[PDB]
Design a protein around this ligand. Sequence first.
Ligand SMILES: [Ca+2]
Lengths: 359, 51
Amino acid sequence: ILDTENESYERRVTAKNLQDPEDKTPELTIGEAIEKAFGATKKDGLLYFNDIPIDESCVELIFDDNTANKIKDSLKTLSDKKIYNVKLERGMNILIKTPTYFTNFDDYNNYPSTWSNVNTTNQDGLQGSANKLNGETKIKIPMSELKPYKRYVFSGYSKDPLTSNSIIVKIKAKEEKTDYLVPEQGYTKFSYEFETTEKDSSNIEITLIGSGTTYLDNLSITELNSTPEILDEPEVKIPTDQEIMDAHKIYFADLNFNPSTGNTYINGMYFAPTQTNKEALDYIQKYRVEATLQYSGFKDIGTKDKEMRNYLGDPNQPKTNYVNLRSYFTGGENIMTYKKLRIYAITPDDRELLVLSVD
Amino acid sequence: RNYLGDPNQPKTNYVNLRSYFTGGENIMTYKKLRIYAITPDDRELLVLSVD
Ligand SMILES: [Ca+2]
């Protein structure tokens, strides 16, 4: 498969299966297969699609387990340790992802803005020139040349012929990731990852600071996948514990009178609606009450749901919370006024709050 | 509501002061009162004032 980040190409090519003598099919190394599978050209021994460099250095490569392990040991045996020189067997599942942004300091400059330190005067890099510049090279991308919610990889090659010193790599991205690189005599790939967000967030900034003379080439950036994220919402408005007790600050007790020694034994309750509490009287779902009955004392009487009757019985007045003390779990007895009583508002989350107390 | 309660008269705007968010109390006449017409676009306009 080819990535070629405007349209993909997939091909199929016959393998040899060395374990059969009667298969007189030709034998092909990987690199040989690629040039025929995509009509690629060899400008310098490197493979070029139309002008896009293609080999182990300039691109990213992706393998299946079998297809990778069958190279893992087929390389330590070969004379040349280049992958494109490994042959082809059946069932290899390969993938060639091309960089979206690439420079070898010889032919290719994808990057919109250029690096702060160039030094293209060289003959190293495994290819043409190489960035020497013992100093540091920054790079800034406006994030407008990037797919927003994706993660890319940053690949390239580094060597230090005196194998003494080393480099840092900062990536100002989703996160500010930190990174230290120890190059070697020969070149080595690094391929550090990072994530982008927000569709013109802060310009994404990659800085490379290294003390002592350093050598670079084939700096590739290339997409991998999408990353989910979350912005900013209107969330659960758990109102308070105070506005509850500010919603019930206005109440009225509906009373059923007794003709003999009239002491207005309670029939129920309300909680007055005004302009403000019409949100705060709504979160209270249950009502715990404990009262003082007639023939016995101060019993605990139920937590049944509210009733939502018309306030004061005035049909024009709206409907608001009614706590029918009559329907609670009394033994069947009335509830006097001017003696002890307490009503608890219990939020749905089992968090009781006192809201008034008869004293 | 029906204007003046006369069923032959048409239906026109009624502002039921009783159904408003009073604490449960009446509204006297010959003492201060003001009614605001609020257009749907949240643009209030005074339309009469008891004085
Ligand atoms: Ca190069």
